[PDB]
Structures are given as C-alpha cells and as structure tokens.
C-alpha cells in the first residue's frame, strides 16, 4: 500500500513511524490559599434594608 | 489615630428633624460594628442604636423605637442618625463608638466592645 503496487521488489523499504500514545491525564496547581469571602454576604446575620 | 468626629448638634424646637453624622478616619470602616449612645445631662449612659458590618442595624430603644433612623455608608466612611418627632426630652450628648473584634476573627458575628469614643454633641430641644 506504500509503493502502490501488487508485487514488491526485494529490499529494505520504509513504510510507516513507530509512536507510544499518552496513558492519563495529569493537572497540576499549587496548593490554593484565598477562598472568596462568600459566606460572610450569605451567612450574614442580618442584611441591610 | 483613629478619629470618631460627629457633627449635627444645635438648639431645634420640637417637632422637628435632625441628622446627625460620624465620621470615621484611622481604619477600615467595613469591619467594625458601629454604635449611637446618648448621653443624658448629669444622668447615666443609655444605648440607643447600632449598625453592624454589612450596614444592617441591630434594633433601636425601646423608649426610642419608631422615630429614629439609622443609616450607613461604606464608601464615605460616614454614618448618619435621622431623628424624628423631637421632644423637649430629647436633649443629651451623643457618642458614636466602635466595636473591638473584628468580624470573622473569633460563634455568630461580635457587637460588643465599644472602646473608642468620640467627643459628644450638645443636641438640645426647646419651644
């Protein structure tokens, strides 16, 4: 299928590219320190008018 | 330093309005539980109002409910005391004061310690 013939004529031929393929998936960040104050706005003990 | 400055005092007969202002300079304004406390001529001290943090007020006097109004303004740094259907009664020094713990910073949010106060007004009410 390389030469796009039938027969094929004595030799050494290169046809194709010998590949590994990945195995999982990796994410990485440091570790996280600032967490939005959120709780203060939801868990408020008492809202303004 | 801290500055606790209000303004607003002078002599209005009664049936009248006054809106009385603090201004705050020395801290951040948002973390701190505002307070109004009168102070009657030659009497004892008596709580009046409060804003916490979030500029959600805490209730008024019992004696005092239904006249006053409190308001807050983080932006300006300023907090102001409508008051409304003055009374010859109605004369008295008045302090705005701080809290001391700061919100998040230890169960629920801290309203007490008022521990800077500053110099009063001389509101007074007269025919």
């Known amino acids: 299928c390389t030469l796009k013939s039938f027969t094929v004529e004595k030799g050494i031929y290169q046809t194709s590219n010998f590949r590994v393929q990945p195995t999982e998936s990796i994410v990485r960040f440091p570790n996280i320190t600032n967490l939005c104050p959120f709780d203060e706005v939801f868990n408020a003990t008492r809202f303004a008018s | 330093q801290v500055q606790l400055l209000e303004s607003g005092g002078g002599l209005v007969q009664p049936g009248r309005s006054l809106r009385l202002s603090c201004a705050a300079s020395?801290?951040?304004?948002?973390?701190?539980?505002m307070h109004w406390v009168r102070q009657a001529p030659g009497k004892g001290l008596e709580w009046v109002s409060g804003?916490?943090?979030?500029?959600?007020?805490?209730g008024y006097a019992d004696s005092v409910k239904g006249r006053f109004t409190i308001s807050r303004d983080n932006a300006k740094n300023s907090l102001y005391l409508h008051m409304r259907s003055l009374r010859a009664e109605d004369t008295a020094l008045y302090y705005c004061?701080?809290?001391?713990?700061?919100?998040?910073?230890?169960?629920?949010?801290?309203?007490?310690?008022?521990?800077?106060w500053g110099q009063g007004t001389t509101v007074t009410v007269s025919s």
């Open positions: 020395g801290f951040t304004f948002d973390d701190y539980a």
């Open positions: 004061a701080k809290a001391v713990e700061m919100v998040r910073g230890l169960g629920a949010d801290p309203e007490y310690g008022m521990d800077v």
């Open positions: 804003v916490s943090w979030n500029s959600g007020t805490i």
